Swiss-Prot record, chain B:
Belongs to the ethylene receptor family. It comes from the Eukaryota. It is found in: Endoplasmic reticulum membrane. The chain holds residues 308 to 406 of 613 of the full protein. This is Ethylene response sensor 1. Coiled coil: none annotated. Expressed in etiolated seedlings, leaves, stems, roots, flowers, embryos, anthers, carpels and ovules. Ethylene receptor related to bacterial two-component regulators. Acts as a redundant negative regulator of ethylene signaling. Autophosphorylated on both His and Ser residues in the presence of manganese. Loss of His autophosphorylation in the presence of both manganese and magnesium. Disruption phenotype: No visible phenotype in ethylene response; due to the redundancy with ETR1. Ers1 and etr1 double mutants display a constitutive ethylene-response phenotype. The gene is ERS1. Induction: By ethylene. The modification Phosphohistidine is found at H47. Homodimer; disulfide-linked. Heteromer with ETR1.
């Protein structure tokens, strides 16, 4: 009955190989996705920085109360979005 | 070479494999959970960014209907184009970054 044993081994051994391969593949797929995520992060944040800069400058110019209030909203929003893009960068770095 | 020793040798190998199997299977369950949690975070980020981008797009568009100096209009048109570009980039890249 080492036919049970020797066969149980063969059975575990390929079972293990499958599990390990399946895990490594998931890992590499997550890493590839994280790489692109991180590579695109500058192109996401930079326009937001421009919007923050331009909004801030606009607040220095002659605005009506309605324009000013709208532009203050653009600015707080843009700042929020920039923070979140930074949290996205952090995510992409988690498995590092 | 005892009958016991021979068995010991085979059962041992079997037990070493079984232990590794348990470890590999635990690590699989963990990796599935980490993949799902990462997908959820990307979905949530996308959702959280969508509202303020739409605000920026919408307010810059409304602003362009009001009375602006030429310099102000160029700055606000640049805001609108930039915000359109980025809203789409963020959504596309977060989508592509999920693992299904």
């Amino acid at each position: 009955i080492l036919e049970e044993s020797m066969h149980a081994r063969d059975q575990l051994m390929e079972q293990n190989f499958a599990l390990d391969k399946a895990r490594q593949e998931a890992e590499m797929a997550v890493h590839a996705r994280n790489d692109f995520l991180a590579v695109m992060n500058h192109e996401m944040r930079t326009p937001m920085h421009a919007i923050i800069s331009l909004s801030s400058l606009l607040l220095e110019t002659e605005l009506s109360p309605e324009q000013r209030v709208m532009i203050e909203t653009i600015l707080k929003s843009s700042n929020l979005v920039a923070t979140l893009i930074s949290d996205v960068l952090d995510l992409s770095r988690l498995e590092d």
